[PDB]
Amino acid sequence: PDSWDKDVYPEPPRRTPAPAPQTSLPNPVTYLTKIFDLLVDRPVTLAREFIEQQHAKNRYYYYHREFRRVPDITECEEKDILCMFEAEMQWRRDYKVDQEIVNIIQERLKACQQREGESYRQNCAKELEQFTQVSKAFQDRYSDLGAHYSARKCLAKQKQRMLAERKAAKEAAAA
Amino acid sequence: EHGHSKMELPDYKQWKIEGTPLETVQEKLAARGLRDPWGRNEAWRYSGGFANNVSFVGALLKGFKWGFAAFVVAVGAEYYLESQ
Amino acid sequence: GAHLARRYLGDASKEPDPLRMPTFPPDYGFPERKEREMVATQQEMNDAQLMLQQRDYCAHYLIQLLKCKRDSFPNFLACKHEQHDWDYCEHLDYVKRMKEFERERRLLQRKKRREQREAEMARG
Amino acid sequence: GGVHIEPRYRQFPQLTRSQLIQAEFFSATMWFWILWRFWHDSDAVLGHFPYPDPSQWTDEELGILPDDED
Amino acid sequence: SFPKYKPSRLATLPATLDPAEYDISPETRKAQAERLAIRSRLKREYLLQYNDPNRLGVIEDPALIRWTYARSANIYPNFRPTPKTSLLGALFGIGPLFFWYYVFKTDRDKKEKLIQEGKLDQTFNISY
Amino acid sequence: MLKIIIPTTMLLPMTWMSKHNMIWINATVHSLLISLISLSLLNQLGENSLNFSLTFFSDSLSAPLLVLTTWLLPLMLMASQSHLSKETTTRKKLYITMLILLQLFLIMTFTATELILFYILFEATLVPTLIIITRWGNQTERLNAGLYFLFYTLAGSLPLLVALVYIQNTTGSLNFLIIHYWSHPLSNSWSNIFMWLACIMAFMVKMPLYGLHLWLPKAHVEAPIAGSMVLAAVLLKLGGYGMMRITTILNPLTNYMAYPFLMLSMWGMIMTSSICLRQTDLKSLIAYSSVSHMALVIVAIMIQTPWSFMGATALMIAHGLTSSMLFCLANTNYERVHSRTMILARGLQTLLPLMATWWLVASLTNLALPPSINLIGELFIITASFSWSNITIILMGMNMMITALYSLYMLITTQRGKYTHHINNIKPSFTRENALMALHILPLLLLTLNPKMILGPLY
Amino acid sequence: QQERDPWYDWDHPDLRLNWGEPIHWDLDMYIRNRVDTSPTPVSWNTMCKHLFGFVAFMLFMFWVGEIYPSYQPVGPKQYPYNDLYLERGGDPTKEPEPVVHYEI
Amino acid sequence: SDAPPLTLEAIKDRVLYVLKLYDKIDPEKLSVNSHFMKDLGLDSLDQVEIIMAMEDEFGFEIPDIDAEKLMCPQEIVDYIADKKDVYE
Amino acid sequence: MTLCLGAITTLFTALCAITQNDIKKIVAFSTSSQLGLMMVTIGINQPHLAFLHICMHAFFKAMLFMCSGSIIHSLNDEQDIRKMGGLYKAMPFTTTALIIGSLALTGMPYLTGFYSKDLIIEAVNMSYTNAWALLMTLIATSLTAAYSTRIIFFAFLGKPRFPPLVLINENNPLLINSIKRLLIGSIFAGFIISNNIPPMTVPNTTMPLYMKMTALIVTIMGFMLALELNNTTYYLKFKYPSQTYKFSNMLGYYPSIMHRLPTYHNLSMSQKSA
Amino acid sequence: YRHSIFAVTHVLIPVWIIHYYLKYHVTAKPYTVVERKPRIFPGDTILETGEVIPLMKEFPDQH
Amino acid sequence: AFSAPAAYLTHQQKVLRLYKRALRHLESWCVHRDKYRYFACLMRARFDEHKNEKDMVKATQLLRQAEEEFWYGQHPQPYIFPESPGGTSYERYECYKVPEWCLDDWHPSEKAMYPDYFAKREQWKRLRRESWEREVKQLQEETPPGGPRTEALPPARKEGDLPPLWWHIVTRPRERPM
Numbered sequence A: 001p002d003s004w005d006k007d008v009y010p011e012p013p014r015r016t017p018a019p020a021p022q023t024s025l026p027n028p029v030t031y032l033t034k035i036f037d038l039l040v041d042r043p044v045t046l047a048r049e050f051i052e053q054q055h056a057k058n059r060y061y062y063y064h065r066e067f068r069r070v071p072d073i074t075e076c077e078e079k080d081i082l083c084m085f086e087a088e089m090q091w092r093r094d095y096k097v098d099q100e101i102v103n104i105i106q107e108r109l110k111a112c113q114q115r116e117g118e119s120y121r122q123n124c125a126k127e128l129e130q131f132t133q134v135s136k137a138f139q140d141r142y143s144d145l146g147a148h149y150s151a152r153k154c155l156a157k158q159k160q161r162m163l164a165e166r167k168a169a170k171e172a173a174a175a
Numbered sequence B: 001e002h003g004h005s006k007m008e009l010p011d012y013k014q015w016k017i018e019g020t021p022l023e024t025v026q027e028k029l030a031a032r033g034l035r036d037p038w039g040r041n042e043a044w045r046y047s048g049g050f051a052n053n054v055s056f057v058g059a060l061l062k063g064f065k066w067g068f069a070a071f072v073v074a075v076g077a078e079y080y081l082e083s084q
Numbered sequence C: 001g002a003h004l005a006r007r008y009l010g011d012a013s014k015e016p017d018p019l020r021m022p023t024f025p026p027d028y029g030f031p032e033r034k035e036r037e038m039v040a041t042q043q044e045m046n047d048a049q050l051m052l053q054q055r056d057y058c059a060h061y062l063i064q065l066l067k068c069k070r071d072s073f074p075n076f077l078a079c080k081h082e083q084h085d086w087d088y089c090e091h092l093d094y095v096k097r098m099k100e101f102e103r104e105r106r107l108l109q110r111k112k113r114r115e116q117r118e119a120e121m122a123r124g
Numbered sequence D: 001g002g003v004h005i006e007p008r009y010r011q012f013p014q015l016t017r018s019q020l021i022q023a024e025f026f027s028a029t030m031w032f033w034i035l036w037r038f039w040h041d042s043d044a045v046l047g048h049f050p051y052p053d054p055s056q057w058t059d060e061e062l063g064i065l066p067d068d069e070d
Numbered sequence E: 001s002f003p004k005y006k007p008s009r010l011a012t013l014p015a016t017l018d019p020a021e022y023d024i025s026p027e028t029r030k031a032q033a034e035r036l037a038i039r040s041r042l043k044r045e046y047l048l049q050y051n052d053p054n055r056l057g058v059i060e061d062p063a064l065i066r067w068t069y070a071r072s073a074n075i076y077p078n079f080r081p082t083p084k085t086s087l088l089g090a091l092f093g094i095g096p097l098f099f100w101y102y103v104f105k106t107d108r109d110k111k112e113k114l115i116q117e118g119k120l121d122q123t124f125n126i127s128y
Numbered sequence F: 001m002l003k004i005i006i007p008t009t010m011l012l013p014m015t016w017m018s019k020h021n022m023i024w025i026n027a028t029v030h031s032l033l034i035s036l037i038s039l040s041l042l043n044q045l046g047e048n049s050l051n052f053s054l055t056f057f058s059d060s061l062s063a064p065l066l067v068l069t070t071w072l073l074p075l076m077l078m079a080s081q082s083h084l085s086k087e088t089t090t091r092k093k094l095y096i097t098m099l100i101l102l103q104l105f106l107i108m109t110f111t112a113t114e115l116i117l118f119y120i121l122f123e124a125t126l127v128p129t130l131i132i133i134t135r136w137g138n139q140t141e142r143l144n145a146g147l148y149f150l151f152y153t154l155a156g157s158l159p160l161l162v163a164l165v166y167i168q169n170t171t172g173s174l175n176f177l178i179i180h181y182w183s184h185p186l187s188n189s190w191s192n193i194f195m196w197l198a199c200i201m202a203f204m205v206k207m208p209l210y211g212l213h214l215w216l217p218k219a220h221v222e223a224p225i226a227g228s229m230v231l232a233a234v235l236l237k238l239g240g241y242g243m244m245r246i247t248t249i250l251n252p253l254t255n256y257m258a259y260p261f262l263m264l265s266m267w268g269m270i271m272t273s274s275i276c277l278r279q280t281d282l283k284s285l286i287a288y289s290s291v292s293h294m295a296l297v298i299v300a301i302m303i304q305t306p307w308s309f310m311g312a313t314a315l316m317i318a319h320g321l322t323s324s325m326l327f328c329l330a331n332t333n334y335e336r337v338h339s340r341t342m343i344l345a346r347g348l349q350t351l352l353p354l355m356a357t358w359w360l361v362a363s364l365t366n367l368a369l370p371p372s373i374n375l376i377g378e379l380f381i382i383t384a385s386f387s388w389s390n391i392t393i394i395l396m397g398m399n400m401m402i403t404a405l406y407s408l409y410m411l412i413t414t415q416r417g418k419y420t421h422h423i424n425n426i427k428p429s430f431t432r433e434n435a436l437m438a439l440h441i442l443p444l445l446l447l448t449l450n451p452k453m454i455l456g457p458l459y
Numbered sequence G: 001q002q003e004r005d006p007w008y009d010w011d012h013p014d015l016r017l018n019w020g021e022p023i024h025w026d027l028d029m030y031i032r033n034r035v036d037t038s039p040t041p042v043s044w045n046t047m048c049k050h051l052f053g054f055v056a057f058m059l060f061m062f063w064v065g066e067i068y069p070s071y072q073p074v075g076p077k078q079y080p081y082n083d084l085y086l087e088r089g090g091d092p093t094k095e096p097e098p099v100v101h102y103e104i
Numbered sequence H: 001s002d003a004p005p006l007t008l009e010a011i012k013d014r015v016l017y018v019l020k021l022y023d024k025i026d027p028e029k030l031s032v033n034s035h036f037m038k039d040l041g042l043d044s045l046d047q048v049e050i051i052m053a054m055e056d057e058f059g060f061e062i063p064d065i066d067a068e069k070l071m072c073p074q075e076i077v078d079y080i081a082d083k084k085d086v087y088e
Numbered sequence I: 001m002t003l004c005l006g007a008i009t010t011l012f013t014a015l016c017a018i019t020q021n022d023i024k025k026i027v028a029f030s031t032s033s034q035l036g037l038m039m040v041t042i043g044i045n046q047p048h049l050a051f052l053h054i055c056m057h058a059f060f061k062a063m064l065f066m067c068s069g070s071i072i073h074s075l076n077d078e079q080d081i082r083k084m085g086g087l088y089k090a091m092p093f094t095t096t097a098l099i100i101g102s103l104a105l106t107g108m109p110y111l112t113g114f115y116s117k118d119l120i121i122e123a124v125n126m127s128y129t130n131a132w133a134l135l136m137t138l139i140a141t142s143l144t145a146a147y148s149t150r151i152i153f154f155a156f157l158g159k160p161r162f163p164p165l166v167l168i169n170e171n172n173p174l175l176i177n178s179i180k181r182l183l184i185g186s187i188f189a190g191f192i193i194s195n196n197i198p199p200m201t202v203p204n205t206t207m208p209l210y211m212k213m214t215a216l217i218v219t220i221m222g223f224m225l226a227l228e229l230n231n232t233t234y235y236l237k238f239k240y241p242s243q244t245y246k247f248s249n250m251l252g253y254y255p256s257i258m259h260r261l262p263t264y265h266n267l268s269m270s271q272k273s274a
Numbered sequence J: 001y002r003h004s005i006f007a008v009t010h011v012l013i014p015v016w017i018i019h020y021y022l023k024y025h026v027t028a029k030p031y032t033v034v035e036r037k038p039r040i041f042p043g044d045t046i047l048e049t050g051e052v053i054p055l056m057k058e059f060p061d062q063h
Numbered sequence K: 001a002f003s004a005p006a007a008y009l010t011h012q013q014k015v016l017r018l019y020k021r022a023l024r025h026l027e028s029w030c031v032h033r034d035k036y037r038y039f040a041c042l043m044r045a046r047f048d049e050h051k052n053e054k055d056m057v058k059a060t061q062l063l064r065q066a067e068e069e070f071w072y073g074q075h076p077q078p079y080i081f082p083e084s085p086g087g088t089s090y091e092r093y094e095c096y097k098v099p100e101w102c103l104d105d106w107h108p109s110e111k112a113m114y115p116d117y118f119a120k121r122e123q124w125k126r127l128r129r130e131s132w133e134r135e136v137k138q139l140q141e142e143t144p145p146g147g148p149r150t151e152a153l154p155p156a157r158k159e160g161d162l163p164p165l166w167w168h169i170v171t172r173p174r175e176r177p178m
């Protein structure tokens, strides 16, 4: 279906074996599916088609809101309140988008395990690698901030991480 | 629609200890100098359709005869149908 | 089971420990060492997606049995021969495992006998 | 939805022939099924593949030498 | 002779095994007569109040009111700080708090040390 | 925000100039309309807040509490209609005036963009409730109860006032937005320890915290029915809202100052629950259950994680609704028997079956049956506490079990068994009481369909 | 209160109480829905000894069975591709050391 | 259930039927109003065994306090009828 | 842990069952023993076998409770097996269904209980587990046979022991049809379901002859022993019970102690301290 | 007659509503219904592509 | 149940009660009828051996060792009739028992159905109203001073009188109301 992007939600080509029946016996599954089609799919399709025509008679549009970019917290004065307000709003929007990225990756992982079946451990290794990376980055960004999180606290966490990394690199080089 | 049919009790002279384990009980009691005054009260438990018992193995083989007969018939039919 | 009684009431070192079996090199007995062969490839034995524990040397018979069970669906008693073949393959695999256990037991026996003989010769 | 049957008061109760024939029939089919399954499928109880005797195996296929070579 | 039955707190002695009921004296008979008398007086009072066609509402029970008042409102005026009361109160009111504080403080200290050393493996731990 | 405040004020002239026999009708209708109007506050943002003006603002933590506050008044009027029948018109108008004043104070409290204004209204709520408790109370202990309910409260919040002004002399502002944006860490000092204590103790005394809960059984047992409804449902949540608001300036001291209270809560939730097992009074039983639930909310707020806060908000809303329902049911029993003892009237399912159904639903909701919002809150708090320290589950688990016990105990003692033989004045339940029960319970089961509306600003 | 007379005409037949009689302090503890103290056929101490002894014996025997398991005279199950290395976890870039099964 | 609604005549017939199967009592002498101790010369133990027999006959048991003061077949019938709420 | 818990559960509950007098209590302890067997199966890493056993136990245990309810209703709400006598002939349909259900429960070959329980025992015998758990499972099988014997013997074989007014009646189509559907199920569902599902585990193709027949051996031994012990009740000898009988009849004394010692000490504290 | 109306108003209407809801609302979003991938054996052919899977390696067949 | 209790049980009553309990527990132990008959006659013979004993001290020393012997061999799971205080259906119908006075609260639309029943009910109410006023005076004059000594009531002695306190004994709900 075109309602969603196939690249953001990938799927293997879904090859299904042709049905060849060794036994002459008429299986009940085919006949049951034929009666189900005749009694359910046709009337449902007619109703959906009628609704779609009534919708096409009245077509109107809605748009995805675009947000500009604003200076973040790293370039705001100590007590300047307006720049802090704008930077905080921008950081919160980025946080929400980050949550949804993690949601997307998790969805791919959840779907793959079910889709693969009994061979999931070998098959889902690629998906697992992606979720591992995304979860690690998200954990570095936003873990242990607390209930009263803000852009200043995230920046402080990042600064302490960068200081630790620089000290470790200097120690290893000077070892 | 309920069971209002005027059920009438049997005659009490019908119940006798004779031919039941209660007679044996009365013998073992009289060998001591005693008697069972209620022996005729429970005689109805050994009189009617309750006289004949079934053993445990007899109970487990409730439908063995007809089952075996049907099995033999079916085996004969299958043998005669395959050897064709 | 008798092996349980022999190991738990007799000499524990006399008999193999199933957790650490085998304790002897495969080529110790004879240098021929014929290899175990499989029929099912990696990919088709993945596409059949049997189970990790059903993925053993008997897998081709299992795949044939599954093909039967899928084709002759309405009559669930058509493919019985492939069930028998898979059972036979598992039986042969189990007999091989029993042979391995017996070989390990006899090798331990002969090693301990050699140790006792060497001890006696060194003493005398 | 049944029929009228009165109590008996110290006699055997009344029985319909239908329940008797039904009980006999169902026990009969159970026993027929057991016998038929035993005849056609006997390996499920007595086994099918013989259990080999480990002591009967010769030393040649067991990969063992007569305690002198290796 | 058969093995003796030993009564306990949660499995009391049967009436038929009481030695008291076999030591019968006229004083005990008088006591039992008096107990039956007072019980029957209370029963007569209740039944007279109970069969009255005029009566509507609930027959107030002084015993029930006494029970609830004694359990609820009569405790503190009869309270006296004694060694038993003080020790039991201190134990049952202070010991659990300090026990749980020690447990939780110790657990959090070990977890914090592990995190600082880096060996805890918090992979996939996002929601806290 | 004035679109809710002004009608709540016009409720007073409407009540005072109404006819003698039309005060209840007018008050109920217009309270329902104000609730409908306040419902529009639920449309919230993931961004800052609904800053209406310099004085009032709304958030997704304030909005559910405001909606509950506006919705509770019609229920209190319906409940109070019965036991005030033989009362003069002037005194009935004064009763309705007390209720309206309390709602107005609560509404202005939950918006309250500044902290001294919040303190002033948070303290103004004391007077109408004190008058209601000590004036229209049945027993002779009510006076004593009122005293407790007052002085405890003030003893907790008089230091807070001092702390507040001190903050404004160092920070320069008490506006919550500026307080959030310019927050600074608290150094580990004795002065900062005592400032933390002053900031927290006012809301701990009103939660109530275990050991500071003694005023609560007294005030809840001795108050009239509307008093009990508002004390259990809304007034307990003032402490939760205040502690959620004020902990933004207490970090990182809260990391280690929370230990004495957490224990007091975690052990407390056990003790109070155990108390409910041996209780001869219905109102006392419900009050102690309230203490247990609010202790769980305390633990949530002190842990200070997003899941803790979402769970605490959900549990506060759910507990308000359920405790109000239980108090109303017990009052329906009391109006018939006049005794308030659990063991006196028994086997009422035989005489009042639909009321037995109401009892069952209220008990199940208290017992935290999924997917009710009670269990959503409790489960989120349990998960957050488990992440805090894995051993907490033990205590948590015990509390769950104990809760079920006493809940079903209260259901089996009063509804099941054989009826009391000498009580023959148990009339059939009126339409007013059944409507009251339905209006209590239907919003809970409707809210379980849209939980994000009560999950707070961290959703 | 489970051990009162069930055939007396109590005013509260379910609670087995009479109107006006003194009420025990712990009535809500003994209400026939809760702890009862009625005598039992077997003495309390004997019941405790038997229950504790059975449980302890079963625990000890389970530990003994853990020490002395039961199994079959067979070798370990053999799996083809380096003990199913790729299908169990994976790591296809590490070149794990090969294990070859013995044919006997 | 499907239990027939037993009547006073049924209770009396069953009580006398059970009594006649007691060989210690002569069937000719026994009457509905015949006393147990004086008119039939029976013991107290005989009375308790009679009460247990009636209990096993009717499927419900009589408290010892009530049972010990049932001395005629008529009052046993009356007791059973009052216990089971028998109209006619 | 799962294996050990299941083993102790099945042994203890069957042991309590073999000496009960209430028919519903006997069936309840049978259910608990079967659940213990299911958990034993879970412990030895056979989840699909446990699921199959769930599916078959549904059929035959449900129909067993059907039959118990039929007897209880027909004897005017009497549940003790002491007061039910000869019901083999007085109620034939009820008798036949129960005999079938007891045969299925005790793992009679080619019945609904065979295709699960036989495989359970085979898998437990030929796996790396406790010796104690194995022994408990085998003794539980014997005790299962024992209490099935007890039910049949005490409710269907002897002389009648119910009150004189006979009210026995099965002749209602609802009861008959409801019982017969589950009877057909508990006869044929084993073969049908086993042959229709795909292979979900490696079978036990080769087994020692005595190990293949162990389940039948223990079941027959339990049958014979319980029958012989029940046949001594007709003897004109009367002796006081032993300690083991009192232990098994009062449910290992667990409901006494545990429903008096903890609860008391809790409620007491709840009033005295808290 | 009764069974006809029962099957119409208790089976057909719910299945119609559920089928419409699944086919046109639940399916419109990704990963809402994830179906287990069907088994492929040596010797089948795929409808979508048509390639035939090669047979196995002719294991030595005897008994 | 119905009968008013006494202050104490005499030795005769205690011996009879032990006899009844022992017979019941023998019946529980001896499931079959003939075996029970044999052992019940044996117990009866063993029971009346001391029937003609005269002194009180040895008779009370008996019935005591007898009771200890009972408690040793008391069948931990005795047979209980289904409706007895231990049976499986002891209070099964106590949830279907509704008091009569509930009918006073019926809506007149409900009372419109069953008009004959409520006419009879009103006649019963008037009868109770007169009888109670007579009963109070009868019980007042008949009772000894200082309170009753037993909870046993006198019958009606006049012509139109009714037994004192009869309303709540006559109008029991039923044994099986529904």
Ligand SMILES: CCCCCCCCCCCCCCCCCC(=O)OC[C@H](COP(=O)([O-])OCC(O)COP(=O)([O-])OC[C@@H](COC(=O)CCCCCCCCCCCCCCCCC)OC(=O)CCCCCCCCCCCCCCCCC)OC(=O)CCCCCCCCCCCCCCCCC
Residues within 6 Å of the ligand: G053, G054, G056, G057, I015, I018, I019, I135, I138, I139, I142, I143, I146, I150, I218, I221, I222, I225, I226, I229, I233, I239, I240, I241, I242, I243, I244, I245, I246, I248
């Ligand atoms: C590997 C080789 C393979 C071959 C193996 C051998 C082949 C078979 C050999 C048989 C061996 C024994 C089988 C017979 C069982 C006995 C039955 C019997 O006669 O009972 C009558 C008799 C008393 O009868 P009663 O008092 O007259 O009853 C009054 C009426 O009869 C009231 O009666 P009722 O009408 O009310 O109801 C009757 C009911 C009531 O009767 C009872 O009271 C039942 C109680 C005993 C039966 C329980 C047996 C199961 C044992 C498992 C226990 C596990 C260990 C527990 C640990 C406890 C720790 C303290 O009895 C029954 O219904 C039937 C009973 C069971 C028979 C059917 C099953 C038996 C076969 C299964 C067992 C062996 C085969 C296993 C298969 C696998 C192969 C290995 O019971 C006994 O005396 C018990 C005998 C043995 C018990 C041993 C346990 C004693 C523990 C004391 C302390 C020990 C020290 C511990 C130290 C710990 C320190 C911490």
Ligand SMILES: CCCCCCCCCCCCCCCCC[C@@H](O)O[C@H](CO[C@H](O)CCCCCCCCCCCCCCC)COP(=O)(O)OCC[N+](C)(C)C
Residues within 6 Å of the ligand: F188, F189, F190, F193, F197, F210, F211, F212, F257, F260, F261, F264
């Ligand atoms: C009544 C029912 C409950 C109601 C609420 C009760 C809860 C109130 C609890 C108040 C929180 C804790 C109070 C003080 C916490 C500070 C930590 C201190 O106690 O621990 C040690 C402090 O050592 C000693 O405790 C010093 C204080 C000793 C004197 C206090 C009295 C102790 C018991 C009094 C309890 C009375 C409470 C009720 C009062 C009415 C740490 O050693 P140190 O490294 O050096 O100091 C660190 C702090 N610095 C860095 C800022 C300096």
Ligand SMILES: CCCCCCCC/C=C\CCCCCCCC(=O)O[C@H](COC(=O)CCCCCCC/C=C/CCCCCCCC)COP(=O)(O)OCCN
Residues within 6 Å of the ligand: F152, F155, F156, F159, F162, F163, F166, F191, F192, F194, F195, F196, F197, F198, F201, F205, F212
């Ligand atoms: C229901 C009962 C509850 C009772 C309330 C208990 C909480 C008590 C909280 C303390 C009370 C005073 C709070 C202080 C006001 C905040 C302002 C502040 O902290 O400023 C500090 C001042 O802090 C203080 O002065 C506090 C001193 C305490 C004096 C009053 C003691 C009252 C009793 C305290 C012990 C009990 C505390 C816990 C009780 C728990 C509840 C029972 C810094 O002052 P500076 O000198 O300007 O800066 C230092 C650098 N030069």
Ligand SMILES: CCCCCCCCCCCC(=O)SCCNC(=O)CCNC(=O)[C@H](O)C(C)(C)COP(=O)(O)O
Residues within 6 Å of the ligand: H043, H044, H045, H046, K011, K012, K013, K015, K016, K022, K025, K026, K029, K046, K047, K048, K049, K050, K051, K052, K053, K054, K059, K060, K062, K063, K066, K067, K069, K070, K073, K074
């Ligand atoms: C399994 C259960 C085991 C039970 C074990 C118990 C064994 C029982 C053995 C008891 C031994 C005795 O008899 S103890 C003997 C107690 N002492 C006497 O009996 C002396 C005078 N007897 C009486 O007064 C009686 O009531 C009597 C006259 C019989 C009736 O009188 P009635 O004219 O008013 O019917």
